[PDB]
C-alpha cells in the first residue's frame, strides 16, 4: 500500500478530459477521508466523506482560499462502507469536477478556482488503505 497521507503531483495542473482514479479500501471503523486538489496553499476542491457527523454519514465538499473555507456543498448519498474496497474517479470537465464512486455517478463540484493549470497537487488523506492513485486522459 501507498503511504497515507499521499501527495500525487499533477504536472501542469488539471485540464478537462483528465481522469484521476483512486483505489483503496476503507479501514474498519473509519471516521473520515479527504481528497484535496490544491493550488499552492489553496484547496480548489476538498472532497470529504464523514462517517460520523452527528451519527450521520455525509460527503462535504468545499474550497479553501487564503486559509478560509467557503460555502459547503453536501451530499447524503454515501457510497463508502467501513472495511470495503472502493474506486473514486474524478473527471475534470470544463465547468466542474465530476465524481463517480464504484462506477456510479455521485456528485459534481463547480470550479471555484479557475486557474486549472495551477491545481497541481492531489492530497489523499484519512482512514483508508491506499492501493493506487493515478491519472489519464480520456
Ligand atoms: C469556521 C469553520 C469551522 C470549522 C470547520 S470544519 C472543516 O470543514 C471543511 C469543509 O468545509 C473541511 O472538511 C475541514 N477539513 C477536514 C480535513 C480532513 C483531513 C484529513 C482527513 F482524513 C479528513 C478530513 N481537513 N480540513 C474541516 O476541518 C469549517 C469552518
Ligand atoms: Cl472530517
Swiss-Prot record:
GO terms for cellular component: cell surface; collagen-containing extracellular matrix; cytoplasm; cytosol; extracellular exosome; extracellular region; extracellular space; ficolin-1-rich granule membrane. It comes from the Eukaryota. Keywords: Acetylation, Cytoplasm, Differentiation, Disulfide bond, IgE-binding protein, Immunity, Innate immunity, Lectin, mRNA processing, mRNA splicing, Nucleus, Phosphoprotein, Repeat, Secreted, Spliceosome. Its main location: cytoplasm. The modification Phosphoserine is found at residue 76. Residues 6-136 form the Galectin domain. One of its GO terms (biological process) is negative regulation of immunological synapse formation. A beta-D-galactoside binds at residues 69-75. A motif (Nuclear export signal) lies at residues 114-129. A major expression is found in the colonic epithelium. It is also abundant in the activated macrophages. Expressed in fetal membranes. It is found in: Cytoplasm; Nucleus; Secreted. One of its GO terms (molecular function) is IgE binding. Galactose-specific lectin which binds IgE. May mediate with the alpha-3, beta-1 integrin the stimulation by CSPG4 of endothelial cells migration. Together with DMBT1, required for terminal differentiation of columnar epithelial cells during early embryogenesis. In the nucleus: acts as a pre-mRNA splicing factor. Involved in acute inflammatory responses including neutrophil activation and adhesion, chemoattraction of monocytes macrophages, opsonization of apoptotic neutrophils, and activation of mast cells. Probably forms homo- or heterodimers. Interacts with DMBT1. Interacts with CD6 and ALCAM. Forms a complex with the ITGA3, ITGB1 and CSPG4. Interacts with LGALS3BP, LYPD3, ZFTRAF1 and UACA. Interacts with TRIM16; this interaction mediates autophagy of damage endomembranes. Interacts with cargo receptor TMED10; the interaction mediates the translocation from the cytoplasm into the ERGIC (endoplasmic reticulum-Golgi intermediate compartment) and thereby secretion. This is Galectin-3. It comes from Homo sapiens (Human). The lineage of its organism: Eukaryota, Metazoa, Chordata, Craniata, Vertebrata.
Amino acid at each position: 500500500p501507498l503511504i497515507v497521507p499521499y501527495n500525487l503531483p499533477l504536472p501542469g495542473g488539471v485540464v478537462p478530459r483528465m481522469l484521476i482514479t483512486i483505489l483503496g479500501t476503507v479501514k474498519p471503523n473509519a471516521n473520515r477521508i479527504a481528497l484535496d486538489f490544491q493550488r499552492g496553499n489553496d484547496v480548489a476542491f476538498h472532497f470529504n466523506p464523514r462517517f460520523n457527523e452527528n451519527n450521520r454519514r455525509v460527503i462535504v465538499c468545499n474550497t479553501k482560499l487564503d486559509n478560509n473555507w467557503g460555502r459547503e456543498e453536501r451530499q447524503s448519498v454515501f457510497p463508502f462502507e467501513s472495511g470495503k474496497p472502493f474506486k473514486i474517479q474524478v473527471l475534470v470537465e470544463p465547468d466542474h469536477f465530476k465524481v463517480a464512486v464504484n462506477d456510479a455517478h455521485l456528485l459534481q463540484y463547480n470550479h471555484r478556482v479557475k486557474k486549472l493549470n495551477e491545481i497541481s497537487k492531489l492530497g489523499i488523506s484519512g482512514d483508508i488503505d491506499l492501493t493506487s492513485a493515478s491519472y489519464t486522459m480520456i
